[PDB]
């Protein structure tokens, strides 16, 4: 089976997720989403790069794992097992059907032609838009060239056109690099597991002081 990917390239149907109405969908191909040292602190990896889409198309689940493996191997060999953190930010929830013309309607004739042509589940695909982020990588500042090459190598497994953008934020945080640096000096940032939390000065005064001892002097 596994028809060529050319036949399911355009978003032409309303979303068809698995629910209590359709049953028996095959298990998707991609399982792992985070690779590398996925528990480093925020201060360790201040550089981020993205792979941004540029078309309104469909990306198959099979292609997502192929690109994940290709980029992972290059980063490990040249940057080390502990020098990066890779995250895949596209999840396939759309189910594509197939009409088995010869398996279902062959040998024993039954009913053939276009009579009763509603299909059976065949795979899982992901929907993307223009400007949507696909893959993100964070690492040190001295590994900028390595990160760019790894992403450029993995776009040959995707159909369409994609771009590479170096983000201006700090890591995965939604803060500018300069803005985050000065806010941290004010004591309004506390450490967590691989992420951070921020002071909001809109609660009771008691535990706001222990959670943020350096905010109040």
């Amino acid at each position: 089976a596994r028809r060529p990917a050319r036949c399911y390239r355009y978003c032409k149907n309303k979303p068809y997720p698995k629910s209590r109405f359709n049953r028996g969908v095959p298990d998707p191909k991609i399982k792992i989403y985070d690779l590398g040292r996925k528990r480093a602190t925020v201060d360790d990896f201040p550089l981020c790069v993205h792979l941004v889409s540029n078309e309104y198309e469909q990306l198959s689940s099979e292609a997502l794992e192929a690109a994940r493996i290709c980029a992972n191997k290059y980063l490990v060999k040249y940057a080390g097992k502990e020098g990066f953190h890779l995250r895949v930010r596209a999840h396939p929830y759309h189910v594509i059907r197939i009409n088995k013309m010869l398996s279902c309607a062959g040998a024993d004739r039954l009913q053939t032609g276009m009579r009763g042509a509603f299909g059976k589940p065949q795979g899982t695909v992901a929907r993307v838009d223009i400007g949507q982020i696909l893959i993100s990588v964070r690492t040190r500042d001295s590994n900028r060239a390595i990160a760019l090459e790894a992403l450029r190598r993995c776009q040959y497994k995707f159909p369409g056109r994609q771009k590479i953008i170096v983000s201006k934020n700090w890591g995965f945080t939604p803060l500018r690099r300069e803005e985050y640096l000065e806010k941290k000096a004010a004591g309004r940032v506390r450490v967590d597991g691989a992420y951070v939390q921020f002071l909001t000065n809109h609660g009771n005064l008691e535990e706001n002081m222990r959670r943020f001892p350096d905010a109040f002097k």
Binding site: H50, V52, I133, I165, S167, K168, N169
Partner: protein, 158 residues
């Protein structure tokens, strides 16, 4: 394909969010007379005297009054001709309409405003008119010096 009496009314007849429970009791204290202008709005809680889903949102004229219901006259548009329809609705669904209040307010003011001028002896120009184009005026730039603008260059956000 089926056609029941309440088919397709999943959201129309339902009460809103945080509005279930007791019906406000001022509804039953209103009074109606023949010739009044009322509009229909079906309440989900009351299951008696519910009009068909077509009339949910239409406006009509009262023509009959009874112990706990009123008769309303509404005009329905069948293909190529209009038909008069007469329905019976419980008072939990009807409501007085402010459609004609602007007219009734304006006629009262005009009569009194015309009376005072006739004693005084000046034309009124009572009837309304649409909006007219603006007139000439002058704008000073004292302590309001204009600021120059220009388009901004392209920049990447993410």
């Amino acid at each position: 394909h089926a056609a029941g009496l309440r088919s397709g009314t999943r959201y129309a007849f339902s009460r809103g969010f945080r509005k279930h429970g007791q019906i406000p009791l001022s509804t039953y204290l209103r009074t109606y007379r023949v010739g009044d202008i009322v509009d229909i709005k079906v309440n989900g809680a009351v299951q008696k005297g519910m009009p068909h889903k077509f009339y949910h949102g239409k406006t009509g004229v009262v023509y009959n009054v009874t112990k706990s219901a009123v008769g309303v006259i509404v005009y329905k548009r069948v293909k190529h001709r209009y038909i008069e329809k007469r329905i019976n609705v419980r008072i939990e669904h009807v409501k007085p309409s402010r459609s004609r209040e602007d007219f009734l307010r304006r006629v009262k003011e005009n009569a009194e405003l015309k009376k005072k001028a006739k004693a005084e002896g000046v034309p009124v120009q009572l009837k309304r008119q649409p909006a007219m184009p603006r007139e000439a005026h002058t704008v000073s730039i004292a302590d309001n010096k204009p600021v120059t603008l220009a388009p901004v260059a392209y920049e990447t956000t993410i």
